[PDB]
Amino acid sequence: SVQIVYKPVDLSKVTSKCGSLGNIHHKPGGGQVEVKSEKLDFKDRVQSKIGSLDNITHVPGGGNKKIETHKLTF
Amino acid sequence: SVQIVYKPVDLSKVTSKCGSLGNIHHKPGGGQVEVKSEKLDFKDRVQSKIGSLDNITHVPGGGNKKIETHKLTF
Amino acid sequence: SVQIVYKPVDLSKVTSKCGSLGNIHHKPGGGQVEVKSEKLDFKDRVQSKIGSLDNITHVPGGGNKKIETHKLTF
Amino acid sequence: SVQIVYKPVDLSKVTSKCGSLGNIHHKPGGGQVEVKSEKLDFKDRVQSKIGSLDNITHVPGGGNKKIETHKLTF
Amino acid sequence: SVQIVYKPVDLSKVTSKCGSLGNIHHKPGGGQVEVKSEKLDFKDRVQSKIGSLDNITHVPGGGNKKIETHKLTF
Amino acid sequence: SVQIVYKPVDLSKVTSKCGSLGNIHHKPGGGQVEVKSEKLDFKDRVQSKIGSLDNITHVPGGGNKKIETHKLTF
């Protein structure tokens, strides 16, 4: 006979406590771009991007993360 | 017989306490770009990216992470 | 007869405490780029990147990490 | 008096047996070419061929040639 | 008086047996080429070929040639 | 008086047996060729070839050649 009994337990206090968050990006950017091309002749899937500025700003008022995974296999 | 009994137990406090925060990027950037290209002849999948300022500003008011995993196998 | 009894127990306080955080990046960047290119003939998958200020800024108000893993196998 | 009697026989079994016969040509790459030729001044007959990638792929389910030759002469 | 009585015989079993016969060519890269030729001045018949990758793949399920020759002569 | 009676016989078994027969050519490389040439002044018949990678892959499920020759002569 085979038996499995499986009971994972968590009590977690994953937290943050911020008294005053803040962020500024003051007068960023600038810069010319040129791209010039001839007979580029791609033979499979392409992606491009072009530009003076990219600005991924990501500012959570607390941004905590919890990740878990339970498996079993006979 | 094959008995298995499995119980993980966690009590956790995973925290950040932060009396103030701040983040200033001030006049970042500038810079010209040129790309000149000829007879390039790519033969599998391409990604390109071209540009003067690429800012990425990830700034949580606490950004704590808990990552866990449980397995079993025969 | 086989028996396994498996009980890991944790009480943890993985934490941080900051009186006042702060970050400044002040007038960063500048710098021309040129990429002239000719007769390159790439036979397989390509990533290119070109640019004048590539700023990944990552500033959590405490950024604690806990990483955990439980196994069993026959 | 002269006579020729010529009575050849051949009964030969000439065979092959196979299973899962095949080919693969995953991504033949060829390449870039250039033929900046000048003042070549050919005084007699020419044949030419130019290209990135030239292929022959020949796959008979048996190539079992039987080839013969017979003569008589005074 | 003269006579010839020529009576050759052949019974030959010629065979092969196979299973899972095959090929792989996987990403044959070839290459860049260049033929900057000048004033070549050929006084007689020419044949030429240029190119990055040249391939012959040849895969008979059997190649079992039987080849013969017979003569007679006064 | 003359006579020739000529009675050759052949009974030959000629075989091969195989399993999982085949070839692999994984990433053949070739190269960055160049043939700059000048004032060559050929006085005679020519044949030429140029390229980065030249391949033959010949893979019979059997190669079992039987090759023969017969004569008669006064």
Describe the structure.
The structure is a homohexamer of 74-residue chains. Chain A has 74 residues and is mainly beta. Chain A has strands at 2-6, 9-18, 24-26, 33-38, 46-47, 50-58, 65-67. The first copy, chain A, is 0% helix and 51% strand. The first copy, chain A, starts with a strand and ends in a 7-residue tail after the last strand. Chains A and B meet through β1, β2, β3, β4 and β5 of A and β1, β2, β3, β4 and β5 of B. β1 of chain B pairs parallel with β1 (2-6) of chain C, so a sheet runs across the interface. The PDB classes it as protein fibril.
| SS content category of chain A | mainly beta
Distance between the termini of chain A: 14 Å
Which chains make the largest contact?
A: A-B, 74 and 74 residues
Order of helices and strands of chain A: EEEEEEE
Strand content of chain A: over 45%
Which sheet architecture does the biggest sheet of chain A show? none
Oligomer: homohexamer
The helix tally of chain A amounts to 0
Gross morphology of chain A = flat
Cα-based radius of gyration of chain A, to the nearest Å: 25 Å
Helicity level of chain A, as a percent range?
A: under 10%
Compact summary:
The structure is a homohexamer of 74-residue chains. By secondary structure, chain A is mostly beta strands.
What keywords describe this structure?
homohexamer; about 70 residues; mainly beta; 7 strands; about 50% strand; protein fibril; Amyloid; Tau; Neurodegeneration; hexameric
